[PDB]
């Protein structure tokens, strides 16, 4: 009868940002939000490490994405469709652009949404130096 | 390429002289090289892309030098009857039919002269600024294609 872990313990982690290709990096981050690397993987409990990104205001991206890529956003009202381009995201709220990716790479349910909360993105760094912080790459 | 004071950088190139200093940023994937009497330029490959960048930089830096050397300056004629000009201190002010007399800001590091109501010299070190600002003035009232009025460079009349 297959193994089932007990109350784990939140391993935290610290990722850079500069020079990282937006999507490429976003993948790794997600796989960390879920277990998938921890061999006691359990798809119904959430125990993926806490992730903390910093200097997100520096993310690389190929092509002409800075002008090409535009983020849509619907409000309930007529014509409520907004078209914000990448250039403007970073120009304004830049931690935002990293979120719109990883979130879009997490599962859909109630647990998936919990996982998003385990992500902390900054443009800095200078993040709140709580405790653990094992920088990675 | 004599008169230099050139200095290399992780991407840009400084060029001092009797006139001033001008940082002339150039492609990073390019070798500048500084002989002693002249500055050379080297491209890493003969690919289609590198060709274009070689010749560009080959000139950017050349003009950076000839800039602090002899310097650049453009001429500007003013045809048409009432059309005339004068120099209000640092700034130029010209009238060309417009009910409003056109005051003109002298940009950072540029100075122009009016050795005559018709003649207008735009003197400056930064070739870019000279070319742009020169046109800016012409734009204030391009030449009529039905007469012989307005600002001109020094080329044939539009007839």
């Amino acid at each position: 009868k297959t193994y089932v872990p007990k109350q784990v313990e939140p391993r935290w982690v610290l990722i850079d940002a500069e020079g990282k290709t937006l999507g490429r990096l976003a993948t790794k981050i997600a796989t960390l939000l879920r277990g998938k690397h921890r061999p006691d993987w359990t798809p119904n409990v959430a125990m993926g490490d806490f992730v903390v990104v910093v200097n997100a205001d520096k993310i690389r991206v190929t092509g002409k994405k800075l002008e090409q890529k535009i983020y849509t956003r619907y409000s309930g009202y007529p014509g409520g469709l907004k078209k914000i381009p990448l250039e403007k995201m970073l120009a304004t709220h830049p931690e935002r652009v990293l979120e719109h990716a990883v979130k879009g790479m997490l599962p859909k349910g109630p647990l998936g949404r919990r996982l998003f909360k385990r992500l902390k993105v900054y443009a800095g760094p200078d993040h709140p130096h709580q405790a653990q912080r094992p920088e990675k790459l | 390429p004599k008169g230099v004071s050139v200095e290399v950088a992780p991407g840009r190139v400084k060029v001092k002289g009797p006139k001033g200093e001008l940082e002339v940023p150039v492609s990073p994937e390019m070798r500048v090289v500084v002989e002693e009497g002249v500055v050379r330029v080297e491209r890493p490959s003969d690919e289609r892309r590198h060709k274009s960048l070689h010749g560009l930089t080959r000139t950017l830096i050349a003009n950076a030098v000839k800039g602090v050397s002899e310097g650049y300056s453009k001429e500007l004629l003013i045809k048409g009857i009432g059309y005339r000009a004068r120099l209000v201190g640092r700034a130029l002010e010209l009238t060309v039919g417009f009910s409003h007399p056109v005051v003109v800001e002298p940009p950072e590091g540029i100075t122009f002269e009016v050795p005559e109501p018709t003649r207008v010299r735009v003197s400056g070190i930064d070739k870019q600024k000279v070319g742009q600002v020169a046109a800016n003035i012409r734009a204030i009232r391009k030449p009529s294609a039905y007469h012989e009025k307005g600002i001109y460079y020094a080329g044939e009349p539009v007839r």
């Binding site: 409000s75 309930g76 009202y77 007529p78 409520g80 | -």
Partner: protein, 204 residues
């Protein structure tokens, strides 16, 4: 950026030279500055003016603790005027020279549950040729199977009035410091006796 709280006392008209002018009288009584918003403590800049004398009765609340740290007679009301930091003391009508223009804010009269015709000033049906049970009705509200629903924010009957209404560019017709009075161009939201804040316009 100026600012000052007052009440709509009422309105009449006075004569400027050989021309009559409708004016609304605003009592912008002396406002004891109470606190200050700063970039360091609050994250923005502003000033919390008090207004109107409170009896220490209703002040049973620890509001006294707020008034103590400023040594101010307890007031009946207090709101901030954004981005306006007067010298430490008290603001008054003195900041309004005649000929200045002001943006006045007030809570409009409350028109209760209002029909579409009064609220949105619709057209409604005919008093006459048939129908006779939709005279004040709004008629159609949609289409058919597509979109097959009604638009967000569709105009429909409902409560309307008694909301934050700001008029703009009203001319300061006069100013009577002997009475903390303030004359304007007449049209100012809210009913008489209603609190109302007066600011500097955004014409220039």
């Amino acid at each position: 950026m100026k600012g000052i709280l007052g009440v709509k006392v009422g309105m009449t008209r006075i004569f400027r030279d050989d021309r009559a002018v409708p004016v609304t009288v605003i009592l912008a009584g002396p406002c004891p500055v109470v606190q200050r918003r700063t970039p360091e403590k609050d994250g923005y800049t502003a000033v919390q003016l008090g207004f109107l004398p409170q009896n220490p009765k209703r002040v049973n609340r620890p509001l006294k603790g707020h008034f103590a740290k400023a040594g101010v007679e307890p007031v009946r009301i207090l709101r901030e005027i954004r981005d306006f930091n007067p010298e430490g003391d008290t603001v008054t009508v003195e900041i309004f020279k005649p000929g200045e223009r002001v943006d006045v804010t007030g809570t409009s009269k409350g028109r209760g549950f209002a029909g579409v015709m009064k609220r949105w000033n619709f057209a409604g049906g005919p008093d006459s040729h048939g129908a006779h049970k939709i005279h004040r009705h709004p008629g159609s509200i949609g289409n058919r199977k597509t979109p097959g629903r009604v638009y967000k924010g569709k105009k429909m009957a409902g409560h309307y009035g008694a909301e934050r209404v700001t008029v703009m560019n009203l001319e300061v017709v006069d100013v009577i410091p002997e009475e903390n009075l303030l004359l304007v161009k007449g049209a100012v939201p809210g009913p008489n006796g209603g609190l109302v804040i007066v600011r500097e316009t955004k014409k220039a």
